[PDB]
Design a binder for this molecule. Structure first.
Ligand SMILES: CC(C)c1cc(-c2ccc3c(c2)[C@H](N)CO3)cc([C@H](O)Cn2ccc3cccc(C(=O)O)c32)c1
Length: 236
C-alpha cells in the first residue's frame, strides 16, 4: 500500500495473508475470508504454484513478524481459478481457496459480506484498500498491515486512463487524480472493502494497474458483484 497508515488489531478481520512455502516461505498475496472454509483472492497470485500443497493461509495477523514456526495456519485443500482467467490485465482475476478446516470466528478473523443482492446501483463513498504490499516500486513486503482510503472512479473514466486495455464492467477502478495512495505488489488478492450503512462489503479484489500511485493511473480491481453467481456456485 502506497500512502497508507498502519492498521490495528481486529481492524480488518477478513484480511488474510497467503504464504507460499517454496522455495522460501513468504507472503504471496492478500485474500478475504468470505465463508467458514473460503478465501476469495486473485487468480494471478498462483503463477508458478504447482499445487495447493505449498500454500498456507494465516488469519488474525497484524504484523508479518508475528508469524513464527508455531503460528497456527490453515492448509489449502483446493485452488479454484476462474475458467476464463489467463492474466490479471485481461480480467477474470478471481480465485477461491477452499481451506482444509473451518475458521472459528473471533474479533480477529471473520467473514466479509459480498455486495448485496439489490445493491447493484449503490454509490460507495467509504472504500479502503489494505495489505502488506509495497509502498513504492522497489520495496519489500511490509510488516504491519497497511490501509488507505481510495475513491472509486467510474468505468468510463478508468477506460480513458487505460486506452491500451479493455476496462470492462467486470473491473472496478479506484484512485486519486493526483495519485499518492494505491495498492501495489503483494496487496494483490486482498480486498477493496466499502462500508455502507455501517456494514462492510467486499467490492473489489486488488488486481493490477500501471505502476503504483501514479497520477491518473487508478488501481484496477476485480468487480466482485459481477462474480457473485460464480462464487455462490463454487461455495454452495
Ligand atoms: C510495478 C510492480 C512493483 C508490480 C505492481 C503490482 C501491482 C499490484 C497491485 C496493484 C497495482 C500494481 C496497482 N497499483 C493497483 O493494485 C504487482 C506486481 C506483481 O509482480 C504482479 N504479479 C505477477 C505475478 C504474481 C504472483 C503473485 C503475486 C503478484 C502480485 O501482484 O503481488 C504477482 C508488480
Amino acid at each position: 500500500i502506497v500512502g497508507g497508515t498502519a492498521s490495528v488489531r481486529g481492524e480488518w478481520p477478513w484480511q488474510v495473508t497467503l504464504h507460499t512455502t517454496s522455495p522460501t516461505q513468504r507472503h504471496l498475496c492478500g485474500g478475504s475470508i468470505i465463508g467458514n472454509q473460503w478465501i476469495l483472492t486473485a487468480a494471478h497470485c498462483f503463477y508458478g504454484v504447482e499445487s495447493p500443497k505449498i500454500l498456507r493461509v494465516y488469519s488474525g495477523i497484524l504484523n508479518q513478524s508475528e508469524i513464527k514456526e508455531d503460528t497456527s495456519f490453515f492448509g489449502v485443500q483446493e485452488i479454484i481459478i476462474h475458467d476464463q482467467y489467463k492474466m490479471a490485465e485481461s480480467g477474470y482475476d478471481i480465485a477461491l481457496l477452499k481451506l482444509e478446516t473451518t475458521v472459528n470466528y473471533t474479533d480477529s478473523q471473520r467473514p466479509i459480506s459480498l455486495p448485496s443482492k439489490g445493491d447493484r446501483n449503490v454509490i460507495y463513498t467509504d472504500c479502503w484498500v489494505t495489505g502488506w504490499g509495497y509502498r513504492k516500486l522497489r520495496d519489500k513486503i511490509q510488516n504491519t498491515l497497511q490501509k488507505a482510503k481510495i475513491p472509486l472512479v467510474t468505468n468510463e473514466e478508468c477506460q480513458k486512463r487505460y486506452r491500451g486495455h479493455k476496462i470492462t464492467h467486470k473491473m472496478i477502478c479506484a484512485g486519486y487524480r493526483e495519485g499518492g495512495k494505491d495498492a501495489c505488489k503483494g496487496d494483490s488478492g486482498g480486498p477493496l472493502s466499502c462500508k455502507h450503512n455501517e456494514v462492510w462489503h467486499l467490492v473489489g479484489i486488488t488486481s493490477w494497474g500501471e505502476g503504483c500511485a501514479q497520477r491518473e493511473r487508478p488501481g484496477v480491481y476485480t468487480n466482485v458483484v459481477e462474480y457473485v453467481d460464480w462464487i455462490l456456485e463454487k461455495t454452495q
